[PDB]
């Protein structure tokens, strides 16, 4: 499965995920992006059962963007989290369930950075760090024994590199590239991905 790992900084949240989309034999695309722009200061990472994730996020995004325009003020990351989860609870028991595991992270001026862990059963949780997919058991420990309550930007990226570096060591298949984004007071920015020669 894909990888959704996030670190809650003192005044920022760095969330990263892969860029490999594969259909049961092979990575179909290598530049596929799996982190969605909820708003100017909130991001969405939806993995899980195919088909459902691509659209459920787009629906959550349209309704998070819709709120940002019909009101003039963007939804707070905690409100967005409650809403994204709220939708899943309604449809989970319906006849068209959304079997998607999602990760939500963003920045709120009043309160600060936040990172919420979303399970396919639509169970919300605020955690300093989290991992999604199968690899979760592989790097969740890496954060546990390595995380600090005041990870700086430079040390934050290094940790994921160690988190990503370990993944390349054990994970059976290939994840050549990963997406890395930073959410801060001035917005959401893009960082460089990673690669490793094997010749």
């Amino acid at each position: 499965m894909e990888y959704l790992i996030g670190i809650q900084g003192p005044d920022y949240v760095l969330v990263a995920s892969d860029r490999v989309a594969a259909s049961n034999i092979v990575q179909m695309k290598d530049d596929h992006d799996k982190m969605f722009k909820m708003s100017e200061k909130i991001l969405l990472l939806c993995v899980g059962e195919a088909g459902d994730t691509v659209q459920f996020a787009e629906y959550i995004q349209k309704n998070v963007q819709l709120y940002k325009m019909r009101n003039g003020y963007e939804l707070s990351p905690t409100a967005a989290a409650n809403f994204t989860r709220r939708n899943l609870a309604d449809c989970l028991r319906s006849r068209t369930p959304y079997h998607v595991n999602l990760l939500l992270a963003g920045y709120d001026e009043h309160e600060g950075p936040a990172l919420y862990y979303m399970d396919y059963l639509a169970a919300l949780a605020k955690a300093p760090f989290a991992a999604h997919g199968y690899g979760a058991f592989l790097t969740l420990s890496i954060l546990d024994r390595y995380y600090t309550p005041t990870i700086s930007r430079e040390r934050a990226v290094e940790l994921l590199r160690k988190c990503l570096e370990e993944l390349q060591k054990r994970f059976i298949l290939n994840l050549p590239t990963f997406s890395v984004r930073i959410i801060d007071k001035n917005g959401i920015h893009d960082l460089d991905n990673i690669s490793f020669p094997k010749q």
């Binding site: 009101n71 003020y73 905690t78 409100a79 409650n82 709220r86 009043h110």
Partner: protein
């Protein structure tokens, strides 16, 4: 004529039924709200003051909608009750979906949309209820909003609807110091306005209801003034009037 039903447009392009409702809103008892730097307040006049009427709710005109909102009422009783119930339902539905208090203007817009839908679809008479909204939200803080039977709301610093709304609003405009009113000063101005907004002299405490919104340690306590403090404010206004006439 062109007032048989709401859907009918006059040749000049006026919803005659909506205008009739907005004119009829004047029959309702006087209510007003002054926005203060530390909070906002509402004032209402109990038209029914019969000795045989038992006061069981104390909030005939001022209702609590959410933990951080309250809205006074003016208009038909049945329409007012339906509108307040719908307001509570909308606020709690928003809380359930988003898990944060409605930013006031959202509730105002929802109620205005309901009223507009009523004034558009045929077979429904316009809600002849104009109700003032107060509350605090993380986005803009203290706000006072006016809702008309036509669904046209609007931010306001101090307004009065019902009997003699024009005089109360005009003399609030005359003596409202923008950005320099405290809750005590707001209550003093509200009592001063209510004294002459109603024909009844001496502004009996039992005949006036005042509710205040305050921001205490992040709780947004809505307090309905007890008769004791209302009487104290009335006595203070009487002494102030005596002092003013001292110049005579």
């Amino acid at each position: 004529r062109y007032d048989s039903r709401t859907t009918i447009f006059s040749p000049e392009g006026r919803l005659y039924q909506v205008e009739y409702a907005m004119e009829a809103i004047g029959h309702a008892g006087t209510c007003l709200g002054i926005l203060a730097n530390d909070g906002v307040l509402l004032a209402a006049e109990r038209r029914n003051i019969h000795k045989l009427l038992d006061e069981v709710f104390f909030s005939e005109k001022i209702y609590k909608l959410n933990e951080d909102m309250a809205c006074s009422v003016a208009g038909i009783t049945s329409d007012a009750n339906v509108l307040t119930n719908e307001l509570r339902l909308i606020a709690q539905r928003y809380l359930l979906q988003y898990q944060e208090p409605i930013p006031c203007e959202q509730l105002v817009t929802a109620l205005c949309d309901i009223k507009q839908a009523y004034t558009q679809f045929g077979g429904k008479r316009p809600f002849g209820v104009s109700l003032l909204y107060i509350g605090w939200d993380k986005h803009y803080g203290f706000q006072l909003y006016q809702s008309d039977p036509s669904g046209n709301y609007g931010g306001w610093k101090a307004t009065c609807i019902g009997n003699n709304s024009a005089a109360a609003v005009s003399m609030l405009k005359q003596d409202y110091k923008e950005g320099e009113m405290t809750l005590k000063s707001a209550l003093a101005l509200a009592i001063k306005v209510l004294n002459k907004t109603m024909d009844v002299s001496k502004l009996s405490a039992e005949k006036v209801e005042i509710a205040t919104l305050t921001r205490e340690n992040g709780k947004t306590v809505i307090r309905v003034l007890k008769q004791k403090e209302v009487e104290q404010l009335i006595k203070k206004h009487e002494e102030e009037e005596a002092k003013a006439e001292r110049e005579k």
